A paper describes a structure:
Refinement of the class that appears to have the best-resolved density for the entire 20S complex (Class IV) without symmetry restraints yielded two reconstructions of 20S complexes (FL-20S-1 and FL-20S-2 at 4.4 Å); each reconstruction reveals density for a 20S complex which differs from previous reconstructions in several key ways. Most importantly, a tube of density runs from the [name] complex to the center of the D1 ring of [name], suggesting direct engagement of substrate. Regarding substrate loading, both FL-20S classes reveal a spire in which the N-terminal end of the [name] complex is positioned over the D1 ring by two α[name] molecules, each of which is in turn bound by two N domains. Critically, and in contrast to previous studies, the map is of sufficient quality to permit explicit assignment of the four [name] α-helices and thus the determination of the absolute orientation of the [name] complex in the FL-20S complex. While both FL-20S classes show clear density for the spire, its orientation varies by a discrete rotation (if viewed from the D1 end, counter-clockwise) about the hexamer axis as well as a slight translation in the hexamer plane away from the split in the D1 ring in each. In the first class, protomers A and B engage one α[name], while protomers C and D engage the other (left). In the second class, the N domain is shifted by one protomer counter-clockwise about the hexamer axis, with domains B and C engaging the first α[name] and domains D and E engaging the second (right). This difference results in a 53.2° rotation of the αSNAPs and [name] complex about the hexamer axis. Finally, and most important, density consistent with the N-terminal residues of [name]-25A runs from the tip of the [name] complex to the center of the D1 ring, where it assumes an extended conformation at a 61.0° angle relative to the plane of the D1 ring. While it has been previously speculated that [name]-25A is the [name] complex member upon which [name] directly acts, this is the first direct structural evidence of such an interaction.
Numbering used by the authors:
A (entry chain H): 50 to 83, 141 to 204
B (entry chain J): 32 to 89
C (entry chain C): 1 to 154
D (entry chain L): 8 to 293
E (entry chain I): 191 to 256
F (entry chain K): 140 to 293
């Protein structure tokens, strides 16, 4: 999950400069225009440590995936607006032939 | 034992909160593919359009 | 002699499963001939061919004891080649076998005279190839047994 | 207000002219205007809940783009036309998904080709039951996903191959699949706790395979037999295939529920278990 | 305390069963996000190969003005 | 040469704040490099990842095995240098998953330092069940007990 959340950080690395060229190349375009129970008790205390490690990272993975989903909330809007920009920019650039 | 039963059953419900997450996980894993696949062609063909464009206006 | 790749298969019926003979089709080899199954450099086993009208040309049928001895199943690649014994030093004259009931849920204490068993043993397993430690099954008076070749003498 | 007028109005304009209507140029801006009318038409057909002329409108909108300069957005419109009749019952969508394959396969776009080549098999199996061609396309698409080495897309194809090689009953090929994919998985921590699931999936695929390959593929795949889901594979399998070698179905059927007590069974496994149980039963009569 | 011996057996088998229920949900969870990691692999394709088309195309459209 | 490729490539990924491959290809360097030949690179790499691992609220749980890898590499070192990481690191040892990092270590340090094997080996007798052991961990197990051999084996 961690290496994939920082994979999503490299998604951010892609999306920012894509949208930076595509808030820009539209303008360049119009420039182009122109006793054992106690052993069981020990097993129980082993499990009492287990459930602590469980719950700690359970709450933490809740926060973790919420963070990645707001990161997705960024991606969706900016990538989709940039999807509109690529098709209008391509068709506008082609309609200025001749 | 029953103290631990209550604690652990709270943690059954923490996993049920992870089940509450997992539909919100999987649908979003779907729709991000549902954009990336459609983004791929619009990304792909624009260099070809650029080639079509720049042969003329030197 | 070239050795042909074959596929270890399943014995057609229950009659030939009591013979410890590599059941084959009449369309490939012939009953009486001897072959050497090859599965790996450290696994060369010798079997007796026994044609039968229900084997598909290009497949060799094996019984459970052979498969439970050679560790073979229905459908792997094996190389089978005709092998010609040396009668002078390979004819069996006195052979010890460890006998035991095949089906553990059919165990009795009745006496079965071996003097009749050897005679029926040679009257059924004649012209066959047997190696040391080989296990098979014998049908004596409608009773299944589990033989185990312990020693062979020329 | 519907696009049935837009189609005929652009169909007046779609003529391949030899007159002053061309002059020196053709109708290039005119035919882009026309294909934009077809684009807008094919969109509002889906907006109007039509589902049957709508994908036809996408077909024609792309069709009048195929011969111009670029099959590409016309290919994406064929992908959309494959997304058109797919929700609907008609089979026209699969044909458009072929058209997309022989544009994207024909052009070098095996990735998106494999993206919907799997959906074709999802329709040939789930919807339009033709399951040997569904399986041939899972297998072919997994060949493509392994072309670009995208592994688990191919493995998700191979379960639909291999898992449906059980009811198509080629067990010999079912065990030919989970080996090379799961012995590749012990190096991966990504799937190792899952890999022994696959060598339950390899192991229990019997056509009554009673070799010790089942006793050895569990070992080549080095596997601590005191693993506690291999307790749910290996020694499970020992009780499942020793009782067959005992010729004794009763403690078999008691211990398969004992497995159910500790890990509940699902569809593909349970069906193959009653299958192999038939083999065990039909062997215990004779 | 055969009441409490039988409960020491039975209630604690239910305790393992409850952990088995969450264990089912968790092997589901972990193998599910595992399986999602392949869609992340197709991102890894469509995150920079997308850039390898786009940024490379705008390297010639921005320079098509030249 | 591939580890040099990971190294220079991770130098590029470092200089672009693509921290993913920056940590990753370094881990690929150190995990094979430590066992085969480079020793100070092992802890230097697993500490360079470990500090900025402790930094981020996303990363500081991956640091547990990272400092496990820093610790259990012993460099012909008999010492508690892993315990130097213990009284360094932000373990919060009431987090018991680091007891499979360092209480493991708090046994085996004095097992290796008192040249004892039936406590060192016992650590993995119990730890193989509670953690599946991959090839690198068991090769490092064999590594520290080659140091035990060099402590014991005459």
């Amino acid at each position: 999950l961690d290496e994939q959340g920082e994979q999503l950080d490299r998604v951010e690395e892609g999306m920012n400069h894509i949208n930076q060229d595509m808030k820009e190349a539209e303008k360049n375009l119009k420039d182009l225009g122109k006793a054992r129970e106690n052993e069981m008790d020990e097993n129980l205390e082993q499990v009492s440590g287990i459930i602590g490690n469980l719950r700690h990272m359970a709450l933490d993975m809740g926060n973790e995936i919420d963070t990645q989903n707001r990161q997705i909330d960024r991606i969706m809007e900016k990538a989709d607006s940039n999807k509109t920009r690529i098709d209008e920019a391509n068709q506008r650039a082609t309609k200025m032939l001749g | 034992l029953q103290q631990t039963q209550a604690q652990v059953d709270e943690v059954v419900d923490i996993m049920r909160v992870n089940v509450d997450k997992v539909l919100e996980r999987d649908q979003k894993l779907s729709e991000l593919d549902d954009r990336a696949d459609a983004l791929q062609a619009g990304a792909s063909q624009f260099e070809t359009s650029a080639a079509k464009l720049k042969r003329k206006y030197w | 002699m070239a050795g042909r790749s074959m596929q270890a298969a399943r014995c057609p019926t229950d009659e030939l499963s009591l013979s410890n003979c590599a059941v084959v089709s009449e369309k490939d080899y012939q009953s009486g001939q001897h072959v050497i199954v090859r599965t790996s450099p450290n696994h060369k086993y010798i079997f007796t061919l026994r044609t039968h009208p229900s084997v598909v040309p290009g497949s060799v049928a094996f019984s459970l004891p052979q498969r439970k001895w050679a560790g073979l199943s229905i459908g792997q690649e094996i190389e089978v080649a005709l092998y010609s014994f040396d009668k002078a030093k390979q004819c069996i004259g006195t052979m010890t076998i460890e006998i035991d009931f095949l089906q553990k849920k059919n165990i009795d204490s009745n006496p079965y005279d071996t003097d009749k068993m050897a005679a029926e043993f040679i009257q059924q397993f004649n012209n066959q190839a047997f190696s040391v430690g080989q296990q098979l099954v014998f049908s004596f008076n409608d009773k299944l047994f589990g033989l185990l070749v312990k020693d062979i003498e020329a | 207000a519907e696009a049935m007028a837009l189609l005929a109005e652009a169909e007046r304009k779609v003529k391949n002219s030899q007159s002053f209507f061309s002059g020196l140029f053709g109708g290039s801006s005119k035919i882009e205007e026309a294909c934009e009318i077809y684009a807008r038409a094919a969109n509002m057909f889906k907006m109007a809940k039509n589902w049957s002329a709508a994908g036809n409108a996408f077909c024609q909108a792309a069709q009048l783009h195929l011969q111009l300069q670029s099959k590409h957005d016309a290919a994406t419109c064929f992908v959309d036309a494959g997304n058109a009749f797919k929700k609907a019952d008609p089979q026209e969508a699969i044909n458009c998904l072929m058209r997309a394959i022989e544009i994207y396969t024909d052009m070098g776009r095996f990735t998106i080709a494999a993206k919907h080549h799997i959906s074709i098999a999802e329709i040939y199996e789930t919807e339009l039951v033709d399951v040997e061609k569904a399986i041939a396309h899972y297998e072919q698409s997994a060949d493509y996903y392994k072309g670009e080495e995208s592994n688990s897309s191919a493995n998700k194809c191979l379960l639909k191959v291999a898992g449906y090689a059980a009811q198509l009953e080629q067990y010999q090929k079912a065990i030919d699949i989970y080996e090379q994919v799961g012995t590749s998985a012990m190096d991966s921590p990504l799937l190792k706790y899952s890999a022994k699931d696959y060598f339950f999936k390899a192991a229990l695929c019997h056509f009554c395979i009673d070799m010790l390959n089942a006793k050895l593929a569990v070992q080549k795949y080095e596997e601590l037999f005191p693993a506690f889901s291999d307790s749910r594979e290996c020694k499970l399998m020992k009780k499942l295939l020793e009782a067959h070698e005992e010729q004794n179905v009763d403690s078999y059927t008691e211990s398969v529920k004992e497995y159910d007590s500790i890990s509940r069974l699902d569809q593909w496994l349970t069906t193959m278990l009653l299958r192999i149980k038939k083999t065990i039963q039909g062997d215990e009569e004779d | 305390a055969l009441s409490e011996i039988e409960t020491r057996h039975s209630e604690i088998i239910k305790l393992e069963n409850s952990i088995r229920e969450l264990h089912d949900m968790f092997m589901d969870m972990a193998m599910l996000v595992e399986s999602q990691g392949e869609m992340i692999d197709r991102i890894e394709y469509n995150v920079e190969h997308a850039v390898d088309y786009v940024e490379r195309a705008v390297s010639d459209t921005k320079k098509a003005v030249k």
